[PDB]
Design a protein around this ligand. Sequence first.
Ligand SMILES: *[C@@H]1O[C@H](CO)[C@@H](O[C@@H]2O[C@H](CO)[C@@H](O[C@@H]3O[C@H](CO[C@H]4O[C@H](CO)[C@@H](O)[C@H](O[C@H]5O[C@H](CO)[C@@H](O)[C@H](O)[C@@H]5O)[C@@H]4O)[C@@H](O)[C@H](O)[C@@H]3O)[C@H](O)[C@H]2NC(C)=O)[C@H](O)[C@H]1NC(C)=O
Ligand SMILES: C=CC1=C(C)/C(=C/c2[nH]c(/C=C3N=C(/C=C4\NC(=O)C(C)=C4C=C)C(C)=C\3CCC(=O)O)c(CCC(=O)O)c2C)NC1=O
Ligand SMILES: *[C@@H]1O[C@H](CO)[C@@H](O[C@@H]2O[C@H](CO)[C@@H](O)[C@H](O)[C@H]2NC(C)=O)[C@H](O)[C@H]1NC(C)=O
Ligand SMILES: *[C@@H]1O[C@H](CO)[C@@H](O[C@@H]2O[C@H](CO)[C@@H](O)[C@H](O)[C@H]2NC(C)=O)[C@H](O)[C@H]1NC(C)=O
Ligand SMILES: *[C@@H]1O[C@H](CO)[C@@H](O[C@@H]2O[C@H](CO)[C@@H](O)[C@H](O)[C@H]2NC(C)=O)[C@H](O)[C@H]1NC(C)=O
Ligand SMILES: CCCCC/C=C/C/C=C/CCCCCCCC(=O)O
Ligand SMILES: *[C@@H]1O[C@H](CO)[C@@H](O)[C@H](O)[C@H]1NC(C)=O
Ligand SMILES: *[C@@H]1O[C@H](CO)[C@@H](O)[C@H](O)[C@H]1NC(C)=O
Ligand SMILES: *[C@@H]1O[C@H](CO)[C@@H](O)[C@H](O)[C@H]1NC(C)=O
Lengths: 48, 289, 48, 33, 145
Amino acid sequence: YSVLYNSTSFSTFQCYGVSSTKLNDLCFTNVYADSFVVRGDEVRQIAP
Amino acid sequence: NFRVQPQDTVVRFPNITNLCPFSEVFNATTFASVYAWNRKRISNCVADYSVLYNSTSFSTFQCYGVSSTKLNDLCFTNVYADSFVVRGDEVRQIAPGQTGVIADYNYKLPDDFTGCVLAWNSRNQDASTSGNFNYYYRIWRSEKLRPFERDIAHYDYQVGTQFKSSLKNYGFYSSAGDSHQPYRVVVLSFELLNAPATVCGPKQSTELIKNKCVNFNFNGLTGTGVLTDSNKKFQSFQQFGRDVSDFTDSVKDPKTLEVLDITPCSYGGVSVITPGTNASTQVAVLYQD
Amino acid sequence: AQALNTLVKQLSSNFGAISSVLNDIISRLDKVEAEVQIDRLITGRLQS
Amino acid sequence: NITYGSHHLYVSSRTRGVYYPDDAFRSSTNVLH
Amino acid sequence: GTTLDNDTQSVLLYNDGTHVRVEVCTFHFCPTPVFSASSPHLYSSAFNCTLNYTLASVRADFTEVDGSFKTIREFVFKLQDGSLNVYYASTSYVLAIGATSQLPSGVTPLVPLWKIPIGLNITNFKTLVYLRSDNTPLQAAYVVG
Ligand SMILES: *[C@@H]1O[C@H](CO)[C@@H](O[C@@H]2O[C@H](CO)[C@@H](O[C@@H]3O[C@H](CO[C@H]4O[C@H](CO)[C@@H](O)[C@H](O[C@H]5O[C@H](CO)[C@@H](O)[C@H](O)[C@@H]5O)[C@@H]4O)[C@@H](O)[C@H](O)[C@@H]3O)[C@H](O)[C@H]2NC(C)=O)[C@H](O)[C@H]1NC(C)=O
Ligand SMILES: C=CC1=C(C)/C(=C/c2[nH]c(/C=C3N=C(/C=C4\NC(=O)C(C)=C4C=C)C(C)=C\3CCC(=O)O)c(CCC(=O)O)c2C)NC1=O
Ligand SMILES: *[C@@H]1O[C@H](CO)[C@@H](O[C@@H]2O[C@H](CO)[C@@H](O)[C@H](O)[C@H]2NC(C)=O)[C@H](O)[C@H]1NC(C)=O
Ligand SMILES: *[C@@H]1O[C@H](CO)[C@@H](O[C@@H]2O[C@H](CO)[C@@H](O)[C@H](O)[C@H]2NC(C)=O)[C@H](O)[C@H]1NC(C)=O
Ligand SMILES: *[C@@H]1O[C@H](CO)[C@@H](O[C@@H]2O[C@H](CO)[C@@H](O)[C@H](O)[C@H]2NC(C)=O)[C@H](O)[C@H]1NC(C)=O
Ligand SMILES: CCCCC/C=C/C/C=C/CCCCCCCC(=O)O
Ligand SMILES: *[C@@H]1O[C@H](CO)[C@@H](O)[C@H](O)[C@H]1NC(C)=O
Ligand SMILES: *[C@@H]1O[C@H](CO)[C@@H](O)[C@H](O)[C@H]1NC(C)=O
Ligand SMILES: *[C@@H]1O[C@H](CO)[C@@H](O)[C@H](O)[C@H]1NC(C)=O
C-alpha cells in the first residue's frame, strides 16, 4: 500500500477494528474489496 | 463534614503585555514545504485568538488533549507553531495515529499529542493557472518518521532499476478540485498545568486574597481552597506542588514569585443528635474538631 | 484449588474490551486506542 | 590534525545520573517513577 | 547527529566563551572538531540551518587552571518527541591528577535545564574540547553512560 504513495491520494481513509499504523505488521483473513461510485455528500454514508 | 463555600475569586496569571504573533504565523507570505516544516517558538504572549475572527477562517480546528472552549482560561507551556503546505486530501493525515505519505515520511504527530491542528484552503496564494511548483513532499524514507522529526536531506532511491529523487513536486493548479488544492496547516503544540508558562489566554488576573476560601485560578489551574503563605522553596522549574495524593497543595504565584499553600475549605466532622420524629423537632449538633 | 483455578479461568473475560487477550489488542491497535482496552482489562483483573 | 592517541577505562556509575523526573514540587515523600 | 557529515543535519551545542549556543545546521565538520585558541575550528561550512539561538549567557573562560580537578559537571541528554532535553547539575569533586579514576559517591539530582526542538534523529554524538595554542590537550576527563 506504499506503492500508492506515488500516484494515488485519498480524501477519505478510515479504518474500523484496526489502527491504520498497524496495517503493515498484520496478516488479513478473508479479504474483500467492494468498489462503487457515489456522490460527494454520500461518502459519509459509507460507515457503520 | 463542615463545608465552607467560596466567596471571592482569585485569578493569577503572569503579567504579559504582548499579543501572540497570529499575523506572523497565519498571514506569512511564504509557508515551508511539508518535508522541511518550519517550527516557531512561541513565548511571552497573550493567546487571544479572537482577533482572527475578523479576517481568517479555518476548515480544520481539531484540538487534542484540551477542549476548544477551555483555551481562553488556560496558560500554555513550551508552545511551538509548526507551519507547512499540504494537499487538500492530506490534511486529515495531520492527526495522531495516522498513516499515509505525509504522516510516514513528512510530518508525524505524537500518539499522546497535546495541542491543536489548524488548516485552511490556500488557493490563489499557493496555486497558479500555469501551476505552482514551489512545494515539495517526501515520497520515501526507508524508515517512518518519529514524532516531530524533520528530514531535509536530498537523496535518491531505487525505483525498479533506476534511481529517482525521494522529493516529489506538488503540482498546484488553479481550479484543480478541492482535494488537490493547496492547504496551509498550522500545528500548535504545548503542555498544560505542569510547568511554568509564559503564553496565556486573556483572563484579567485579580488581586491575591489569603486566609479565605476562594475560587482560585493559577496559570489555568482552577480550584477551590484557602491560600496561605508557605515556607516552601520552589526550584525555578516548578510551578505546582503535590502531597502524597495527587492534589495541588501549593502553587508558585506567577506575579510575585512566592509559594502559596493551598488548603481545602471543608473540614471537621459534624454529627446531629435528635430524639424521635413525632417526639421533638429540636436537635443538638456535635461539632467535632 | 478451586479459588486458584477460578482466578486462572477469569483471565478469559473481556471486561467490555474488544478482546480478553492483551496480545490481540496490542497487535491490532496503536497505543492511543489499545490503552483504553488495556485499562478495561487491568480494572477487571484487579477486581478479580 | 591531532594524533595524540586515546585512553579509555571502564568505571562504575555509583548512583550517578539521578535527575528530577517531573516539574512537580514534592517534599518528605518516596515516589516511584 | 547520525553520520556527522554534510549529507545529514547535525546539532551543535557548545559554549563559545560567553554564551551557550545551539545550531541545528548541515555541517561539513572537520575530521576532528575541536577548539584551538578559544576560536571555533568545528566546521568548514553550514548551509541548511534550521535552528540557531543562544540558550544561556554563562561566562566560561578558556584559561588553563593548575592543580587537581575541582568540579564535576553531570549531564543527561534524552530525546522526547523530537526535542533534546538537557538535565544538568554541577558538584564540587576534588579529584587528584594521578588518583584512581572513579565517579563520586552519593546522589546529586540533575535539574531540567533546556528543551531544544532539534527535530532530528540522534544515534551518535561526539564531544568538543579545547586545547592550548600549540594544539596540546589539557588535563580533563569525561564519562559516557
Ligand atoms: C534515523 O537514524 C538511523 C540511523 O542512521 C537512519 O535509519 C537507519 O539507517 C541504517 C543505516 O545506519 C539502516 O540500516 C541498513 O539499511 C538497509 C535496509 O535495507 C532496505 O533498503 C535497501 C535499499 O534501500 C533495500 O535493498 C532493502 O530491501 C530488502 O527488503 C525489502 C523489503 O523491505 C525486500 O523487498 C528486498 O528484497 C530486500 O530484502 C531494504 O528495504 C540495509 O542496508 C541494512 O539491512 C541495514 O538495516 C536502517 O535501515 C535505517 N533504519 C530503519 C528503521 O530502516 C535514519 O536515516 C535516521 N534519520 C535521519 C533523518 O537521519
Ligand atoms: C555547554 C553547556 C553548558 C551548560 C549545560 C551550562 C549550564 C550552566 N552553567 C552554569 C554555570 C557555569 N558553568 C560553567 C562552565 C561550564 N559548565 C558546563 O556545563 C560546561 C560544559 C562548561 C564549560 C564550557 C561556568 C564557568 C559557569 C559560570 C559560573 C559563574 O559565572 O559564577 C549554570 C549556572 C548559571 C547561574 O547560576 O546563573 C548553568 C545552568 N553551561 C554550559 O556551558
Ligand atoms: C513510484 O511510482 C512508480 C510508477 O509510476 C512505481 O514504480 C513501479 O513499481 C512497480 C511495483 O509496484 C515495479 O514493478 C515497476 O517496475 C516500477 N516502474 C518502473 C518504471 O520502474 C513505484 O513503486 C513508485 N515508488 C514509490 C511509491 O516509492
Ligand atoms: C495579510 O497580508 C496581506 C498582504 O500584506 C494583507 O492584504 C492587504 O490588506 C490591506 C488591508 O486590508 C490592503 O490595503 C492591501 O491592499 C492588501 N494587500 C497588500 C499586498 O498589502 C492582508 O490584509 C493581511 N491579513 C491580515 C489578517 O493581516
Ligand atoms: C548563528 O547565528 C550567529 C549569530 O548571528 C552567527 O554568528 C555570526 O556569524 C557572522 C558570519 O560569520 C559573523 O559576522 C558574526 O560576527 C557572528 N555573530 C556572533 C554573535 O558570533 C552564526 O554564524 C550562525 N550560525 C550558522 C549560520 O551556522
Ligand atoms: C488491493 C487492496 C488489498 C487490501 C489488503 C488488506 C488491506 C490492508 C491494507 C489497507 C490499506 C489500503 C491502502 C491505504 C493507503 C493509505 C494511503 C493514504 O493515506 O493516502
Ligand atoms: C510583573 O511580574 C513580575 C515578575 O517578575 C513582578 O516582579 C512584577 O511585580 C509584576 N508587575 C506588577 C505591576 O505587579
Ligand atoms: C561534502 O562532503 C564531502 C565529503 O567530505 C566533500 O567532498 C564535499 O565537498 C562536501 N560538500 C560541501 C558542499 O560541503
Ligand atoms: C538544502 O541545500 C541545498 C543546496 O544548497 C538547497 O538546494 C536546498 O533547497 C536546501 N534545502 C532546504 C533549505 O530545505
